[PDB]
Symmetry: C9
Subunit: 191 residues, 9 copies
């Protein structure tokens, strides 16, 4: 097991959802340094050190020390970085056709998320590695309908829509990123 310290990884995408959404709602989750710490945890051996999160821990230790009137493990490597970018439509498109009286159509869009992870040495402060990974986010819509006349009338509609969970894609990106960092570390080795 190797002790890894990670404090914060930002959303540097600087992006927000368009209308109808609230102009306050980010296009990307604020959750990394959770995603990342659990990615390091689940890829074990790595032993995540918290530091989120550090203030509370320090308070708790203050309470402990107060109750009695005993040390805190460090990390030789630190992971840093942020969420590099988000956009759309990137690649997007769709088709459709309507004949009397049955129409049908379909649409799709792709999005991009990029992430940067950096392994930095704690002793020398040198950056031992850094990587950019980018996943893509699918969205699609399918519709079919029927408009027919008799005389009286008839009509019908069916439809389905899917959005890949940006949070899941982020998780994917940070995981493949950690895989890459570990792999890169194997040729170092530091281990």
């Amino acid at each position: 097991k190797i002790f890894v310290s990670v404090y914060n990884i930002q959303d540097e995408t600087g992006q927000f959802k368009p209308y109808p959404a609230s102009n306050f709602s980010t296009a990307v989750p604020q959750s990394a340094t959770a995603m990342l710490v659990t990615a390091l945890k689940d890829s074990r051996w790595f032993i995540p050190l918290e530091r989120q999160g550090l203030q509370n821990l320090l308070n708790e230790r203050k309470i402990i020390r107060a109750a009695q009137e005993q040390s805190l493990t460090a990390a030789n490597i630190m992971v840093e970085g942020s969420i590099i970018g988000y956009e759309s439509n990137v690649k997007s498109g769709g088709v459709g056709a309507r004949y009397f009286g049955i129409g049908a159509d379909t649409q799709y869009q792709l999005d991009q998320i990029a992430v940067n992870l950096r392994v930095v040495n704690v002793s020398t402060g040198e950056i031992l590695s850094s990587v950019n990974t980018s996943k893509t986010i699918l969205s699609y819509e399918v519709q079919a309908g029927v408009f027919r006349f008799i005389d009286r009338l008839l009509e019908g509609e069916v439809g389905y829509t899917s959005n890949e969970p940006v949070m899941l894609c982020l998780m994917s990106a940070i995981e493949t990123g950690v895989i890459f960092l570990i792999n890169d570390g194997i040729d170092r080795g530091l281990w």
Copy 2:
């Protein structure tokens, strides 16, 4: 084979925060979050109800410290610590994820139905207080259903006739958050069962 625990464990939880960065869309107020700010209550009541575990407050800590100031003053008696700390946050929220619906209209009786699913994710981390090492962590995800059903009639006589009926249901996102945090707490409690920490 067989596992076994021993006794109650004091757990301190300060903030489990909303890292979703999300807010409801229009018509809603752009200030209204898509997700409750209420965890570190949901979680604290999960730990209280999942006993044996003993939540240590710390929300919440300052008011207590003040009250202790009043006590110490009025008399002119220590404060128990927690050996584990739970942390984490609400990892994410989105929509439509999966969504869709169908409908049909024949003269003169129409009907239709629609539905949407949403997702919320939560992260819980058990961290050791002495060494500051993270002992465990889990990501959990619930989904949030919404659906609408409508039926109607347009008919001519000569005179005329029409009618409408409809029903809608939205799963309570707060309940879904709670459900998620329960799933996470169950997961953590078993991992500790195989450890044991106890």
Copy 3:
């Protein structure tokens, strides 16, 4: 009687009314630590200790102490918690029908509010109990109308709407919550 201290119970619902309303107008009242303090007061025996509210009291005591040139009771239990959640439509629906020429219709929506109360020990700082309770908020509209032709013409409309007072439902929730807190203490007993 037991002295109970309550400082802040907060709105953690993070919700605001939709349009036409002002985006600054909360979906839920800010009034708890009053509603709750009066709930504890009214179920007495409990003796709410203020602390809202505390600063003014401290100033007033400064003034007294100056004018005289006599202590301040504490509480062994503290109540905490907040308003956990709010939403809508949750469940909603309605029906209606129109035949010549008399139409009628009706609608309803239900909402939810949840609350958390926690009894915490002041001495050791341990949480003695915590409970979540949730009420629901009814709203409905009724309309009836007539459209008739003669030659000349005739029409008429009547309607009524009712919305349950979200504030009252909050009071209800906090009250039932006070009941649950009171009960678990009975087997404690403290």
Copy 4:
């Protein structure tokens, strides 16, 4: 009821905990309820006299003025053994609402009404022990109505006419009212204590 006697009551602030604002067309910054309590309340306590409101609004200017006085000379400040606290608890609408109307050729007429609710919380607190001696919630309701009548007639030429009237009870008055019954309730409640 009855005075004695006079009791010094200090009130610093009673605040709007309603968190409510007027809807469109109004400005989203415009509160649904007045910020004027701790005036309304001070005058309510005053008008029910005996009570002797002690200011504390307001205290900063008074202390500055005393600085000026003390400066001109190069004499104390009475305190209150009770403190009144509390806030504006809640506001809404439509709560209860409705209306009717009918039109025959060519004379139409109609009327509508809405009720709103305002709630207040007052708490009498002991200054010496810091104990809350009482707390009360009162709620008034706010009436509004609109009336219209009209005529559309044809001759051939044409004729039309309209008349209308609307009244909205002054929310500020209902707040004052609420705090007034609240002061009454507080006084009565104190009557059996008695502390006074």
Copy 5:
């Protein structure tokens, strides 16, 4: 003459003009502690003490003291208070009629402004009096028009609108308020 010191009287109406107006513009002027100071000035005997306004005066005195390298009169009573409330439509209404081809119509609205003034003693800090006064604000619009056919065509329009000056009504309320305060003080008498 009696020296009266007045520092702050602020807008507690929490109200703002509706659309089309800018959402930042108050429904009520911020000018009180002037209107009041000039009202007391005009009601003489009273001698307004500034204190607005005080910081600048203190600076100026710093400069005076600096140039020379003579005291500052106080007030035994202080006036306080604020603008209590504003609303609309309160009472409002109107009529109108149109016959071929001449129409005419009229409308009116009333608004309300309330004020609170309090006389407080500077020595004891006791409130010697407090009063709430409320004026109302009139507005009306009148129109007349003609639509006629010849064959060709004819039309005409005339209209007038008047809105009472909210600032003036604030002044009216603050003045009548001053009358109430003096009136109450005379039976004291101090």
Copy 6:
């Protein structure tokens, strides 16, 4: 003859309506310039700066530094603020159209009020205060022709005038200074 003026601020609490930006005031922020030049142009008076004072103090810091000589005071201080702004107050207009020549006209009035107060520097007593108010005219005129031939003919002419609110502010501040000086003649202090 030395007059010191630090503050005159916008207490109108008003902003322009739509189409304008909600950040744009209905009234200039410029007084303590208008007023200082009004006192200057009305001489005898000698404006003492103090806007504006901080920069000067820095400059004197520099002078004093380069050398390793005093600063004149004022026995009277002028104070006050912009009391109010409104519209439509009085407004109206007419128009008529006959085939094919139409014409029409409209007008609106506004109000601006200002308060000036002379305050004594030694005793801090207010020696005088006045409210003065100007009014602001706006008008529009249009004329047009719609005619058919068979083909067609049409034409339009129009003119609009808005009195410069800033200028009206200047006017109010000047008449105010006139009044203050005049009343001062019977004091006189001068």
Copy 7:
């Protein structure tokens, strides 16, 4: 008769600020000022160009003080003052003030024109540094023209013919501001000449 000056005068100008409180209307961003923030540059270059006058910076002063911190630091030599200080601000802005336009259309050739005038006012004050007394002040006002011209043709043949030509001009509010500050500086300079300050 005859006047006369002597020598260069050191003038310090810290801030000349926008007191207009005005912003462009829609379509523009509500954050966009109706008037430039650039005076105390415009004015400083006006004083620089009307030389003899020696603008003293002080904008601007902090960076200068830092650079001198660096200089003084590297060596281990004084700082000139200004005998007069100029102050003032942008007093006001508006529209339509005077505005209007005409136009006519005959078959099938129409034409029309429109115009708007705006105003900017500026205040400059020469203030004495020693006694702090104000030696002079002026209010000046420029006006800002805008106009549009259009011509068009709608004609029928059978088939059809149409045409459009148009031109618009807006005077540069920044130019008008500069012009205003120039007129104020000119006024102040004659006034000082019969003073003299020299």
Copy 8:
């Protein structure tokens, strides 16, 4: 290898996406001082020194020093600079034609991004070099459709749109900036 310390490179474009987008959404990524740090990392010889990022490193070292009751490498040159500008439409255009009953059309837009990088000496604080580079950002849309009558009716639509990843163009720009910087440094040296 030369040790290069880069603290922050900032977005000085002052630009945000237009409607429908949120008025809070930057038109340009905030991600540089990652992009640039990884560009210098990928261009070796260079050894990026962090400094992002520095506070956490310092805290961690505090913890380490606490556990023991061992020094920190510096950089002799520092890279600075920022994202200079962004705009559109800059160049834009498109064509299209529709005949009975088959229509088709296409659009395209270009955007610009500029970047400034500056090599500064740490000892003397002198700017050894500074360069501005600018990439451009392609976007295009294509549609084709058929509207026909029979008697009954028939219609169909197909379309595709591609938008170049502004983040990529930013990366490309910062890389080209690095190339210029290295070129300038070699001629010094």
Copy 9:
């Protein structure tokens, strides 16, 4: 070569883009004090001194000074100033005509940007020079189209639009400004 120190040249235009754009988006880049630093660098003789930018430099030197348990060159001149103004339409206009069935049209707008530079003496704090320069910003649109009837139908459309890169024009203005300052120094000297 002369050492020149430049800290801030700011956007004093107070202007922001109109609708559809975000109300937070400046009409003008925030990039000057880079543009200016690269203009001075490119005009050598001159040696831009950083100072942006200074805090990181001082931190780095803290790291250096700590690692060893060597001075920092000053500038006798400082360049200051700001972006003085931005506007539109200023001059704008256009023509167009349509005959059956072929129409065509074109329109254009001009914008203005002005910049102010000031050379200030560091020793006496006196302003040695200041200049205002202003460039103008062209934008134009061209379109041509055909609507024809047969019976059947026909239509076609082509169009092209260009916007001069406001960032480029600012660069231009700041450059010409640097020229003016250099000349102004030439007769000084």
